[PDB]
Symmetry: D2
Subunit: 380 residues, 4 copies
């Protein structure tokens, strides 16, 4: 029924054989056949299918209201599998500020195989319509994006993609299926880096893909089985386990996010704040219309690099590390950690200033997170 | 010094911090940084590098006398990573009977990205010289091959590849680094499905790649980090653990292989036997010159399909399952399980007759394996 | 600072060596010594100490405001270790309705070793004072108890134990350290079956013990190392991981508990309800004074056995299984599952009627749990 | 049939449900019941029984030709469980040089519970007959013992135990079931620290117990379920996995042991050598009669402490660590590491001289181990 119940009871995460209330870990590569071609439960070779991986695939298919799930060894392996639905000469549209690893994959790997890439500002969906070529086959959208949390209208992107015969894809990592369900809005394929919120505990690298389209699912299964970027059984088990508390974790994160944003907007040492919950944020009404909560990623401007580093050193509960979606609150400086190969002038033009801080809110006590960050800002 | 010692002490498989005599399992995605960019031990994000995966990478680099190791989520993910060293328009030569999954990957995935594929009979290396085009960039060799155990001259293939400016690659799965070291013979890249002998226990799906070439290693690392088919830490740990007994397991397997072949050649219900240890086998002297033991895969002909199935049902210690390299002895019928989409007439022409049986010898007692298979053959 | 923050940042759960933000899994039995007796980080043999187990021990010591933690292979192994602080001839006082496994251990195992056991109704603490003999050495209290949730005054029990020279022990399983901290009230030893709420996910069997007493800690460490009921590293890791969400899970559980109790008290098919939050419950004010939340275990009476079974069959979200503290809501019938060896007449006298149902509230949506149970009760 | 085959195919180590060729890891605490008391496959609570633990229990029962297996969280937890078959006032006979942890348990823990302990030199079995009291209930034998490898006649001990109504117990750790089967010789209970050879890889702490006696098995199961020192599922899985190569590992170890002993006996810097394979060793013919191979533990005398430490520093392939039975060869000095609390004069009297070295032979190449140790001895 309701979402928190669906997280516990949706998907197949018990053992039919023994009744075990958690998914067994099938640390196995192959399976006894009673006769040639006769499989007991449909398993014959773990790269093709493994029952622990099937459990996590059924969870992601259920949570996104799809019919088919796929579990990959990382988020970028999920993205690579989806991009391999195309051939040389095909063209894909992505939002201009897509995740750095996606950018790297498309422009440094798949362009050598004749995939053509166009980055457009999808916050205005008519941009997509202008960029469509006769060879365009895929539309790939992240919303909200990193690190400035730009919002793209999912339902209009789905309509444009249907009209022009495109496979539509949404990277739903930042929102999770708890708050945003692209397949319900007409999107063909939804994917996640489960390394972040879904696993939730900073201890699994994994990607997840869901679809409702039988034929796209067939093509994805073929690509998974031939290029072999499969998630292993132990990581599948830890993913299933982490997803159980997704609802609780996202709601705690959202409570802290609201309070932290009030604090950041009131503080003298903070300039602009980027987050889709701010009413002045571009496409705020679009976000509210397609999601019913918020990501825990917030970006905000302090004066300069030295202020950003002082902020990191003065906080007690914000940890300096890469990734996001942990139970710990994480802090980072994009201009130094993810955008440092961009020339400084272009960085400044795109909004990645030297004092742009990104925090990923965790599940610590709201008042501790607000107070800690405020007292650190006070030292500037 | 000697090989069995190198299996135990080669590579880095202890913990420098606590002294733990086995590699810790770093079930983690990210790492504390003391200052922005300052990494304690060089780790920052597990997709890029994880200390358990690094341990298994150092083992495979040591065992193959290379300098760089890479661990992938499966054998075909290793092969896909290596093939992505090429661009559209590039051409690769493979042996004609390469593994079915490699065939599938090249001709159903990478040809859609403009990679051109030519299959040649590499048992005569001048075949390679005839097939070389101006666009050829890679030579990819399995030796011995599946299921007829055709042998290709590794050192001459390396020389041809150097002469014509080609990246040379050997799939060394069947022999393992215990018996055959392609990098010592001039090959650029060696790879393995560690799902088979290296893991040794039918419980990990994994691929491993080693090279001595700094720049190829750089390109492989970039591809691994951008397409993300990484082996997880638990599977890396189980791989490191399984490799410890590789020498013992391969020597037991080889003792049984010799005795089983004597039995098969003497038996009236058995026609041809395929294995590189038979002196009448094509390129037997080449195999003896580049390897110092034998794979545990044997193929042999019985009369027909019904005889093959009766053989499977009458054996007590040969298990019907896919894969090879287990501690259990495995049995299968290629014409029904791996080549069943080939038309029957072409199957017969290539040697995949309806009574072709493939066994993968395990580590059971030699006399039990010989006696069990002989008494099963006696029922024909 | 606050409890939800302490759950994330208390204890040592990162790797000092690599910076990994989660505790490495030291799947290892022994450790390199640089010289005889010179240990790198103090480890020499995993039964004596293992770094993953040390991580979970430091978490439980921190959460209970103790100084020493101990991790055992199960809750009853923790209890057995604590009972082995006594000698033959020593006498221990327990509350009369202590957990069945504790009862079994004391009266069927440790009485054969000369430990003398007296069960008393500790809801009136002067009962304890009457039962104290010259040979009494230990006072062992569960509060609240199973399945009728009887409450015992912890601080008065601690005072009585100090006055008469007794080791005081509280089984704090039902409340968890999130809501009740016996060591803060003068108790010598606190213990838990971490199989329940602390692990939280129905996937680890484990016990945890904390103390602030150096000499009791020394004796516990000696007993642990000599009788060897240690928790393994993988289970320690999963425990540390599950504890991160303890605060979120307990607060969700408490919201549902309050609403479910309102429903149960209003329903015509339900007679008595047992839970310390009910103001008419014995020692309700004592519970409120020593805890600041509630267990998720509730017991209530329906008419008879057939009604209880119909209740189980009509619910969609209450699962029939043993244990408690899962993310799933669990349901059971004590008279049939935990007290079925007691004669029926004594069962009825102690309150374990044939229609006594026990539910363990999970983290599903509150409205789904209330509605599901109410509609099941309506079918009676 | 033969032993190496039995290691692969004995016991239940596949999944009946999916056909998985390895035992699934049931990381679970509890199990769905279809109706109250109706268990799908007999499981209801993992402390009582877990399917991965059952798999390893069936392996040890098969390998020792028993009917019931039990898996404990460590070797000393297995020993404690067996000792808890007795009551206060009962008396147990052990060999005088029993393992230090067993000694510690009996004389520092179980004597406080009224168990009476007598240590006797069981190398002459009439010693046992002299020590039998009217209260004696158990005879507990290690053969061969640590560190001087004293041999006790198992079959005569079984006969004495039957004659006088005693439970007979053999700690079979050093020999493993591959070479010595006490239950075949009339012993009631056999136990192992699986931390050593059975796991084989220095990565599991575990104990294993087998018996053929239904009523002793019932009592052991009750003790296991009430005191709760159970092995966890991941450690059970790693045990099952390690046991597969036990035969191969023990045979390699035995080849190296024979050659190393020839070298040690010829070397001028080495005085006495202790190992049951030496024909002048006490009860050599008894060992040959009850076992058909040898332990990998060897002890030998050098001049003094400084020589022992120089030996440790000069070896390349002998690792200084505690435990034994690894794939790595291990070295230690008992007088400094296991007997350092004994006064020096009593140490010298019992044979634990300051230059007594103990090595545990691993599976490195025989010639490397012989040459390395000989060249280290040459530096004295
Ligand atoms: C509640 C629930 C649903 C509801 O799905 P929606 O389409 O979001 O309404 C589905 N499956 C399960 C198992 C549920 O518990
Ligand atoms: C024995 C040994 C070697 C030997 O390497 P080769 O090139 O095969 O001679 C290398 N490394 C280690 C750790 C060894 O033990
Ligand atoms: C908040 C916090 C505490 C506070 O402990 P109390 O005694 O409950 O106030 C202790 N340790 C850590 C790491 C904390 O974050
Ligand atoms: C070979 C074998 C046996 C033989 O047992 P013994 O009593 O030692 O002869 C038993 N079980 C299995 C499964 C075997 O393979
Ligand atoms: Na992929
Ligand atoms: Na659709
Ligand atoms: Na790959
Ligand atoms: Na080279
Ligand atoms: Na214990
Ligand atoms: Na105190
Ligand atoms: Na025990
Ligand atoms: Na017997």
């Amino acid at each position: 029924s309701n979402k928190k119940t669906k997280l516990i009871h949706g998907g197949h995460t018990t053992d039919d054989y023994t009744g075990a209330v958690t998914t067994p870990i099938y640390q196995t590569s192959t399976y006894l056949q009673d006769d040639i071609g006769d499989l007991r439960q449909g398993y014959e070779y773990s790269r093709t299918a493994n029952p622990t991986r099937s459990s996590v695939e059924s969870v992601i298919a259920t949570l996104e209201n799809g019919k088919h799930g796929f579990a990959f060894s990382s988020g970028v392996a999920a993205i690579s599998a989806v991009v391999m639905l195309l051939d040389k000469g095909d063209h894909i549209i992505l939002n201009s500020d897509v995740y750095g690893g996606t950018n790297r994959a498309l422009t440094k790997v798949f362009t050598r195989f004749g995939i053509e890439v166009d980055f457009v500002d999808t916050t205005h969906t008519d941009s997509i319509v202008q960029a469509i070529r006769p060879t365009t086959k895929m539309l790939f959208i992240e919303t909200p994006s990193n690190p400035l949390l730009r919002v793209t209208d999912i339902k209009k992107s789905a309509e444009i993609a249907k009209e022009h015969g495109l496979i539509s894809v949404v990277d739903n990592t930042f929102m999770t299926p708890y708050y945003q369900n692209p397949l319900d809005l007409g999107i063909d394929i939804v994917l996640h880096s489960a390394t972040k919120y879904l696993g939730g505990h900073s201890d699994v690298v994994a990607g997840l893909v869901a679809t409702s389209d039988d034929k796209l699912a067939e093509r994805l299964a073929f690509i998974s089985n031939s290029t072999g970027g499969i998630l292993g059984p132990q990581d599948s088990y830890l993913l299933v386990r982490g997803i159980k508390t997704l609802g609780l974790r996202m709601e705690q994160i959202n409570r802290s996010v609201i309070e932290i944003i009030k604090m950041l907007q009131a503080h003298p040492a903070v300039q602009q704040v980027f987050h889709p919950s701010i009413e002045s944020h571009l496409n705020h009404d679009v976000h509210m219309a397609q999601a019913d909560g918020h990501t825990g990623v917030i970006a905000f401007e302090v004066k300069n690099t030295e202020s950003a580093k002082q902020l990191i050193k003065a906080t007690s509960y914000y940890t300096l590390a890469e990734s996001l979606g942990a139970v710990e609150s994480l802090i980072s400086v994009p201009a130094l950690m993810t955008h440092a190969s961009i020339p400084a002038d272009i960085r400044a033009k795109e909004g990645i200033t030297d004092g742009l801080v990104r925090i990923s809110v965790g599940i610590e006590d709201t008042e501790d997170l607000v107070d800690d960050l405020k007292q650190a800002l006070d030292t500037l």
